[PDB]
Symmetry: C3
């Protein structure tokens, strides 16, 4: 029942953020849950986690426990992680599956393509239906070295969602096929998923909110350019910060020899599960990599987590007029907030 | 407003579990809360806890704090555990009440039958009603050596709910009257009460889910026969497992000299408080009895608690088609799931 | 949405408490939140906390984070604690502000009167509206030596809400202007705000529920007189206990040189934030004052917190008939509950 104009934030030079209800309403969240997150490609992992036959991972997004698994035939598949008998979860965590999936409850077994292998005693069950007792699939695709799922059977391909993105990312970081997961920070953040994207889409805040990092880095004339359902923040010692629709962020810091990736998995209007993954090419970490990981964990990320959490609380106040001015300038400077207008302009298209 | 056919699961040979909404909907739970648990006899304890005058226990079921108390006149009574003046709780925990109940807030005193003994200054309050300032009762009955409460004043008697059950239980365990509480495991379980019953009503899962247990024991016949709102699982050193409507289960393991009892006290659609009681006839326990209690606590029960918790999560998934096939076999073998159909057929009569 | 008669508890000699729904319903709370707490003067502190230029405190009441701040010009002001840019909270805790407020997010600065000082880069933002970018004020007034806020722009003055109260309080304690905060107990209490007022408005409970305190003191005359939206419990070495609409209580114990203040900041139907402040005229504390603080913290207050928490649980029971008799005696004795009737008669006017 809450709608946005089709031209909402179409002019970034004179633009404001959503009326606050869009950050807080459970009704708005339920619509975005089905119109956006059940019908878009959702990045869930780096390819290194699913490279070999029988490799699998599990993810939870908008209330759906999903298993992605590389088959014995090396075909990548994704399934709802729920047994078609009486609903027990099939796999937990991540690792290497055996040659069949065995349900922990009554030990029905499934091939890695989801088809029912053996249902105990089914020969003695009247009219047992073998073809509707398979695991339920969804779409999965490998794109740009990462892995995306899609709950909409009618989805096309990741490239139609993020045209040109793979090429640009492989141009910022040429070592993607050999990156390996070094650390993952798991946090349930009490902020709307769009508030966390807003926080990523500008550098207006890094001076005030990231003193130790911005003070040492003399970064001026850093540009934020929009493309097709993704954007690129590029600064100088190159920096790359990609945002991709709806809410996965890829960062290639100065060395261009490593990456950090932010995965946002919305839970409800005021809760978002975040994975903060750090990837290096070497499995054995040096102490310089170990220290860098702890700087991310204990110094950098807490500052951004605190910001979006305070904003979520303030957004409910009757003392917040309703919308915030997006501080875009004529020059599209490094401190311009125009990236927020691009993101919210796209979001508004789902609120017509 | 979610209704089931009257013939739901009337034919166990071709049957499926409830549509998933019945295990997850708060609307369904509120209906079951009032149509079943406020109008059925609810087992709360073994008789040994209330055998002497002034004995009392407290229970919480469907949001109601209940005090069950044996009066000075040796009459067993049950009351809502709330003062008639301004609503302070009257008793906590379990034990021996003094000869009057004294409310901790304004020290009104009540007799063990619920009557107001003395309300201070009531002589000076205009039109004070001594007889509607008594504790509010509900029905209680001793049946089969156990204690049942009922929130419906128009209820009849436990035998009308469970015809023949006491006669049959006393044949399975001839020493019930001499049982004493040896251990109680209290768990607030994140599963619908009906998922927990499903898990009790079949042995399809014992091989897969209780490996250490199914591996040691060579069971030479196993039958699940239905009766009158209760069922009996009987195996061969006999084993007896009774389920009684709505959700109390009584087990008589091989020795037949001790019992374990499962009490389910539903909290909401996705939460059930469970009591797992172990009763032996001797007050001082042997080292083998202590060992058996720890096997139940740390090996056996966690396996069943984990199953129902995983099922409750999987039942919410859009990848669960909706209903699960009840694996009934022609022979009604030891691993047949037909007990579930009987249970769910009874539940369905409450969703007309 | 069930309404009360205009004469509800108009006759204290024959009166009952609200039907239990008024203490538990979220719908009732939402009405009282907007009709009472967003339209009444809410006491937040003693003036001593805001006496000097740049002093500030923060409070939270009915979901609103408020900052009260004494400006460089020595004018006392209050603001919603939310940045007009993108909603980050502005200040935390209490203390001495710098000469401008700096937002932690993007470092907009505000003078202590709420007006925008500096918005970084605003010179390059098209059509930037500086005078609709100030912090949002609400009304604040110093009254009786304490500080009140009001969320209703059309509010008048505290004296219109509490006629004669300041005049009578300064007769109870003549040194209010020299008091200083000696101790504060902060508790999120799981009780409706009206249950907590009930608990304050009678001494019917002091004998049974405060045993160590009742036997210890000698009371030669104790009266509870009602006025205009406030009441006075007065005893003899005088004692004064003031309740003021809606739920701030001021205590002047026998020595009549110190004060105890209860602030209730409701959160929802079943949750109330309480501040219990103890004020002495000397800042450097004696051992007897220090001992007295601990008796309040660990002996006296826990008894009252436990009473209201148990009452809130009991009010939900179907075994509570619905309303409780207010134990008013014809002689308005020391243990008469007639004060509850006065309070509930005032509350009832909002449920017509
Ligand atoms: C894009 N930018 C620099 C604004 C956000 C940073 O990339 C934060 C991060 O990479 O975790
Ligand atoms: C009936 N059966 C054996 C399947 C369940 C077990 O009795 C559970 C139990 O004894 O606690
Ligand atoms: C009003 N009365 C005496 C009932 C309550 C006490 O004043 C509570 C208090 O002083 O904190
Ligand atoms: S739930 Fe998977 S086999 Fe029964
Ligand atoms: S509440 Fe039990 S006596 Fe007042
Ligand atoms: S939110 Fe306060 S300056 Fe950006
Ligand atoms: Fe940041
Ligand atoms: Fe089991
Ligand atoms: Fe008290």
């Amino acid at each position: 029942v809450e709608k946005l104009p089709e031209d909402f934030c179409a002019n970034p030079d004179v633009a404001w953020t959503f009326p606050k209800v869009f950050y807080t309403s459970s009704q708005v969240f339920e619509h975005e849950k089905e119109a956006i997150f059940a019908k878009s490609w959702i990045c869930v992992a780096h390819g290194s986690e699913l490279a070999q036959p029988n490799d699998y991972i599990t993810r939870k997004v908008i209330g759906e426990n999903i298993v992605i698994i590389r088959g014995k035939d090396s075909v990548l598949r994704a399934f709802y992680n729920v047994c078609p008998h009486r609903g027990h979860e099939l796999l937990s965590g991540s690792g290497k599956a055996k040659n069949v999936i065995t349900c922990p409850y009554h030990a029905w077994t499934f091939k890695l393509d989801g088809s029912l292998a053996l249902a105990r005693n089914c020969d003695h069950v009247e009219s047992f239906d073998k073809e509707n007792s398979s695991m339920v699939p969804l779409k999965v695709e490998e794109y740009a070295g990462f892995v995306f799922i899609n709950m909409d059977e009618n989805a096309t391909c990741v490239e139609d969602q993020l045209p040109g993105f793979a090429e640009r990312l492989n141009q910022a970081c040429g070592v993607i096929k050999d990156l390996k997961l070094a650390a993952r920070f798991v946090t349930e953040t009490p902020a709307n998923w769009k508030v966390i994207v807003d926080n990523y889409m500008e550098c207006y805040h890094c001076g005030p909110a990231h003193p130790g990092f911005a003070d040492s880095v003399q970064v001026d004339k850093y540009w934020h350019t929009t493309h097709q359902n993704w954007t690129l923040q590029y600064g100088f010692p190159e920096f790359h910060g990609f945002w991709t629709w709806p809410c996965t962020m890829f960062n290639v810091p100065p060395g261009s020899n490593f990456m950090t990736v932010i995965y946002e998995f919305p839970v409800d209007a005021e809760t978002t599960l975040q994975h903060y993954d750090i990837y290096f090419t070497n499995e054995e970490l040096t102490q310089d990599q170990k220290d860098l990981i702890e700087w991310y964990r204990n110094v950098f990320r807490p500052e951004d987590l605190n910001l979006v959490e305070s904003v979520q609380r303030g957004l409910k106040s009757r003392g917040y007029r309703g919308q915030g001015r997006i501080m875009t300038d004529k020059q599209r400077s490094g401190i311009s907030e125009h990236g927020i207008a691009y993101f919210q302009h796209l979001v508004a298209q789902y609120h017509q």
